[PDB]
């Protein structure tokens, strides 16, 4: 027997690499930093071990979604002049949207440096902090200056495909019962992933991909209460947003070529912004979640859903973006039930204009007012739960870390490095 060298053997090792974007009005995650797309090959008898919790595509996608966010905010207005003293009065002076607003008057710079401009705007009470018609100031003014969300770029997520470079392959687990870890009997080599919409949300995985046959529970260590549980639905739960107000965006020229878009007036339906989830559909979806959740804790255990414990408004609420305006919904009527072995649910949502999105300090963003009435149709395709540390297990909604949102889309994918040079014995002998 003699050593014979084979070049091109189908052998791969696990690897971490830089996957390039691909996609098929400018966007935050635009197509100017991506590549046009064009595929899937079934690898029979191949049983690969996946790990959705130590996947580097999740860590890289988090970096890239952040990077495309900042890259889309540099070329537009920085609101340094908006740190002035505000003389704010109430809008209603008495349940409505107008009880959430302060009518703030301030001196603003003009396009001519030596001239001022007495202007006013309606600021949400969540954006103004009192100084001790009282005197207020914008909330993120002692920490940073808010680069205005540029009005011509949309926040709508477009699907992005992460494609492996040459010498690498993306393995896709086609198993329908694959939780997040261990062998996957059915594997495929895709050129690159399905369109992953970077939907940014907390406590609820809006839009995205459904499970195939049954609700899937995915935790790094189900016995550890410090680990989030990524529930994935099989049938989506439709959630409808609204801001009933007919907003009136107003433009203020704060400098040469720079405009500040302000809420000048609010008329129309002044009901508080809310989201509607069907009460029958949500009840049967939690029934499926509970059924798949007793498999890890016992048949006789009591599964109780409570509401978020505490913390920032971005972590205690179903924070999300819808129609360019950022909502923060309570979701305390969604998660309120105890499970023993036409109607709708209305979630009161607050709205903010000053956004510190990626759990960072020092880089805020001022989302300008959206003219008109905002309406919203989304699919709740998952959950992020945390368990409380007895025969009763309490599952509060979780979140905060944006990586668990994209870990729910990149759980089935894996990047490998092709090792095409292999040696093996054969009856050969070089002449």
């Amino acid at each position: 027997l003699w050593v014979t060298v084979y070049y091109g053997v189908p052998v791969w090792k696990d690897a971490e690499t830089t996957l390039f974007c691909a996609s098929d009005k400018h966007n935050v995650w635009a197509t100017h930093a991506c590549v046009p797309t064009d595929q899937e090959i079934h690898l029979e008898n191949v049983t690969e071990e996946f790990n959705m919790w130590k996947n580097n595509m999740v860590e890289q996608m988090h970096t890239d979604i952040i990077s495309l966010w900042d890259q889309s905010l540099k070329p537009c207005v920085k609101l340094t002049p908006l740190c002035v003293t505000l003389q704010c009065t109430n809008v209603t002076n008495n349940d409505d949207m107008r009880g959430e607003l302060k009518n703030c008057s301030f001196n603003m710079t003009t396009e001519l440096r030596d001239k001022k401009q007495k202007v006013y705007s309606l600021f949400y009470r969540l954006d103004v902090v009192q100084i001790n018609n009282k005197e207020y100031r914008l909330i993120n003014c002692n920490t940073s200056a808010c680069t205005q969300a540029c009005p011509k770029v949309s926040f709508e997520p477009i699907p992005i495909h992460y494609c492996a470079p040459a010498g690498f392959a993306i393995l896709k687990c086609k198993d329908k019962k694959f939780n997040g870890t261990g062998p996957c009997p059915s594997v495929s080599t895709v050129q690159c992933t399905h369109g992953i919409k970077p939907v940014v949300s907390t406590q609820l995985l809006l839009n995205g991909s459904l499970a195939e046959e049954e609700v899937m529970i995915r935790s790094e260590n189900i016995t550890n209460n410090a680990k989030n549980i990524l529930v994935q639905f099989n049938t989506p739960v439709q959630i409808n947003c609204t801001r009933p107000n007919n907003n009136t965006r107003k433009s203020i020229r704060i400098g040469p070529g720079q405009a500040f878009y302000a809420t000048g007036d609010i008329i129309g339906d002044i009901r508080q912004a809310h989201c509607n989830v069907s009460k029958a559909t949500w009840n049967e979806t939690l029934g499926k979640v509970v059924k798949q959740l007793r498999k890890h804790f016992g048949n006789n255990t009591i599964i109780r859903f409570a509401n978020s414990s505490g913390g920032d408004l971005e972590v205690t609420t179903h924070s999300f973006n819808c129609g360019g305006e950022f909502f923060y919904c309570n979701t305390s009527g969604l998660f309120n039930s105890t499970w023993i072995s036409n109607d709708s649910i209305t979630l009161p949502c607050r709205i903010k204009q000053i956004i510190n999105m990626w759990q960072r300090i020092g880089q805020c963003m001022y989302a300008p007012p959206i003219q008109g009435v905002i309406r919203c149709v989304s699919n709740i395709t998952g959950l992020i739960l945390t368990r409380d540390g007895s025969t009763t297990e309490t599952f509060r909604p979780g979140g905060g870390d944006m990586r668990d949102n994209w870990r729910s889309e990149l759980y089935k994918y894996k990047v490998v490095k092709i090792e095409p040079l292999g040696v093996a014995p054969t009856r050969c002998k070089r002449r």
Epitope: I266, I267, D269, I270
Partner: antibody, heavy 127, light 107 residues
């Protein structure tokens, strides 16, 4: 002391341009809206058109394509430029301020426009 | 468009009476209907806006009512300055319209 003053434009020949101008004192053109109301002799009042707070020009359907209004922010003046004037257009023209007050119905907030402040009168006669 | 019908076109009463003026709309214009008084030879002036609110300076005798179709205006303690032509003006639909005018005189 807030008043809208408009001055007589004298009789004008038929099939010409009707140029009106209202002088706004006490208050300014901003924030409200400014419109024109006429009154043919021995008859009721008629709405011609208005510019609302937004800068948007509501016009009466009867006067088709012969209507055009403008606001002189620098001089605080409201202008009317009715064209092709016929003998039926013999009426006293008033300049009005459609003021917006918000009235709250049970759950709905509306901008209600109610012509707060009236001009004095410009008797326009064509012959 | 919306047509406002104001009747009776001529109501006569002496000094110190109570009169009710009617302005019927075509559609339902909610409560958006303002009332204007034109003294003979002068310019019209605002009396009531939103069919119930009194203009600043109008005496408390004047009063309106109704938020459907049959809008009404009531005058109490008639004085010679009240003998003018009243107009009802709707503000619901952008083709704005006026009433025909109720000429109130002395008997």
């Amino acid at each position: 002391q807030a008043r809208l003053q408009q001055w007589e434009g004298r009789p004008l020949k038929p099939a010409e341009t009707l140029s009106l101008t209202c002088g706004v004192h006490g208050v300014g053109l901003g924030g409200s809206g400014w419109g024109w109301i006429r009154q043919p002799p021995g008859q009721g009042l008629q709405w011609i058109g208005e510019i609302d707070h937004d800068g948007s020009h509501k016009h009466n359907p009867a006067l088709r394509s012969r209507l055009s209004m403008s606001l002189d922010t620098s001089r605080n003046q409201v202008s009317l430029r009715l064209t092709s004037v016929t003998a039926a257009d013999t009426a006293i023209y008033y300049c009005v301020r459609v003021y917006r007050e918000k009235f709250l119905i049970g759950e709905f907030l509306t901008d209600y426009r109610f012509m707060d402040m009236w001009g004095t009168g410009t008797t326009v006669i064509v012959s | 468009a919306i047509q406002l019908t104001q009747a009776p076109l001529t109501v006569s009463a002496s000094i110190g009476d109570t009169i009710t003026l009617t302005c019927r709309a075509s559609q339902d214009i909610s409560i958006w209907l303002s009332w204007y008084r034109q003294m003979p030879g002068k310019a019209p002036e605002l009396l009531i806006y939103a069919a119930s609110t009194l203009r600043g300076g109008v005496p408390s005798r004047f009063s309106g009512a109704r938020s459907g179709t049959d809008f009404s205006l009531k005058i109490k303690n008639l004085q010679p300055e009240d003998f003018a032509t009243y107009y009802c003006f709707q503000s619901d639909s952008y083709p704005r319209a006026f009433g025909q005018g109720t000429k109130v005189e002395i008997t």
